[PDB]
Ligand binder design. Sequence first.
Ligand SMILES: CC(C)CCC[C@@H](C)[C@H]1CC[C@H]2[C@@H]3CC=C4C[C@@H](O)CC[C@]4(C)[C@H]3CC[C@]12C
Ligand SMILES: CC(C)CCC[C@@H](C)[C@H]1CC[C@H]2[C@@H]3CC=C4C[C@@H](O)CC[C@]4(C)[C@H]3CC[C@]12C
Ligand SMILES: CC(C)CCC[C@@H](C)[C@H]1CC[C@H]2[C@@H]3CC=C4C[C@@H](O)CC[C@]4(C)[C@H]3CC[C@]12C
Ligand SMILES: CCCCn1c(=O)c2[nH]c([C@@]34C[C@@H]5C[C@@H](C[C@H]3C5)C4)nc2n(/C=C/CO)c1=O
Ligand SMILES: CCCCCCCC/C=C/CCCCCCCC(=O)O
Ligand SMILES: CCCCCCCC/C=C/CCCCCCCC(=O)O
Ligand SMILES: CCCCCCCC/C=C\CCCCCCCC(=O)O
Ligand code: NA
Length: 388
Amino acid sequence: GAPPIMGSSVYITVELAIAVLAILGNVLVCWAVWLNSNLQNVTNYFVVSLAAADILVGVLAIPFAITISTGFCAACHGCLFIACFVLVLAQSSIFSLLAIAIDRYIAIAIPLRYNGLVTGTRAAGIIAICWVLSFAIGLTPMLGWNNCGQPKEGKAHSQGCGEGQVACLFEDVVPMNYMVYFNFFACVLVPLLLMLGVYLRIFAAARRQLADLEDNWETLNDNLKVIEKADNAAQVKDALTKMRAAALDAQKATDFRHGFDILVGQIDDALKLANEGKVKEAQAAAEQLKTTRNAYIQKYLERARSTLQKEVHAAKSAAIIAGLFALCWLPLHIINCFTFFCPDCSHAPLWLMYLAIVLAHTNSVVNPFIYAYRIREFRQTFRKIIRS
Ligand SMILES: CC(C)CCC[C@@H](C)[C@H]1CC[C@H]2[C@@H]3CC=C4C[C@@H](O)CC[C@]4(C)[C@H]3CC[C@]12C
Ligand SMILES: CC(C)CCC[C@@H](C)[C@H]1CC[C@H]2[C@@H]3CC=C4C[C@@H](O)CC[C@]4(C)[C@H]3CC[C@]12C
Ligand SMILES: CC(C)CCC[C@@H](C)[C@H]1CC[C@H]2[C@@H]3CC=C4C[C@@H](O)CC[C@]4(C)[C@H]3CC[C@]12C
Ligand SMILES: CCCCn1c(=O)c2[nH]c([C@@]34C[C@@H]5C[C@@H](C[C@H]3C5)C4)nc2n(/C=C/CO)c1=O
Ligand SMILES: CCCCCCCC/C=C/CCCCCCCC(=O)O
Ligand SMILES: CCCCCCCC/C=C/CCCCCCCC(=O)O
Ligand SMILES: CCCCCCCC/C=C\CCCCCCCC(=O)O
Ligand code: NA
């Protein structure tokens, strides 16, 4: 058995490197949101709440992980806090990820009432409530659901611990059924599955709106061909009524107002000539619609299509962050399941344990890179902060 401090030094040095990277990167995120008013929206307030949790990982959680890896002697309830505080930060991350996904669903499904519904003052209260719940969930072992009542006395006497103290080790103070049933399944697995369903609805809503824009565009062009090769006033009237309804739908479904006023007015002109039985005069009046379509309607169709694709792009960025969190945290939770569900399986090796813990801490580093690589406003702001 090699001296423990040797393998400890590699684990401690890697953890300190992660803390430095987590603090710097996420301080840059908060500094960007504080300075740039274009980044000051409800969605980024949860981002700052998410960066706040990751900053606290480097300042407190990682030093707590280094401390509890030594097995030092401590009072059990004080040991519980050092062991469980990272669960509070992880829970706060879950609430901030679920909130971003919900905020993005509201923006894309009901954009007409998003500004009146999702305000800044309400977002601050949600962040405050989600942090209080995160403490309640993460520090639940301190409310009684712990192993403090049954200490490993032989392990404490071998390490010179005093009376009322224990060897502070995670598995000895935090019960595994809490970590598996309460923390992982209920408070981590279920919310992540909810986020997956929310993002499925977002992308499904985005795809449905883009076929609607294209379907009203084809309906506009197809009925124009029908009018040109019609042979009676009733066929011209049938296509004009379906265009007037389709034009109106675009106006509701959202210079813009003037272009549709011309389009509906020109359809009414040809509709009146069709009801009077003047077929040739209605076809010529319907030909004027192509001028309005080229100068107004097509230009609006590429802006509406451009805005939706930007909402899809922002939605994938958010989804990536959520997926990364799961990727970074699943290994640790899966190891807990093997130990809890299979007591006959051999223990997970010590090196693999600290690899999974280090992987879970690395999630506090990755977010600021995603913003830089996927969001122009954050990346531009990062450069300004750095250069200056
Ligand atoms: C505002 C921030 C920086 C304050 C940080 C407070 C932290 C560092 C404090 C608060 C509670 C403290 C713990 C409370 C009780 C005990 C029991 C004792 O037998 C060993 C130390 C131990 C385990 C303490 C370690 C340090 C501790 C975790
Ligand atoms: C997000 C997705 C991956 C869902 C998470 C699935 C988790 C809960 C699954 C995936 C693999 C599963 C483990 C696979 C194998 C074993 C060994 C067996 O002797 C007891 C159950 C146990 C320990 C399973 C427990 C639950 C488990 C960890
Ligand atoms: C979410 C993605 C990255 C999947 C992660 C897969 C990881 C977490 C899986 C793959 C193989 C797994 C190991 C396979 C076999 C054993 C031996 C058993 O005696 C204890 C658990 C242990 C040591 C498992 C721990 C978890 C493990 C390392
Ligand atoms: C990012 C921190 C997440 C919270 N967390 C855990 O979830 C966690 N599970 C475990 C194990 C090891 C052994 C086999 C399985 C059951 C128990 C006992 C795994 N040890 C953990 N530790 C600390 C470890 C020593 O430093 C821990 O901090
Ligand atoms: C919405 C949930 C409310 C937020 C969670 C806060 C719960 C309020 C009550 C807290 C009491 C906790 C006191 C724990 C001390 C335990 C002492 C001991 O067991 O030895
Ligand atoms: C871990 C135990 C979980 C604790 C559950 C307790 C339930 C607390 C839930 C609170 C959410 C409601 C917030 C109400 C704030 C006021 C809102 C308002 O004034 O408009
Ligand atoms: C900006 C915030 C600064 C806080 C970080 C300070 C550095 C923390 C580094 C290591 C913590 C480990 C100290 C105690 C380890 C256990 C040793 C023991 O008591 O037996
Ligand atoms: Na996080």
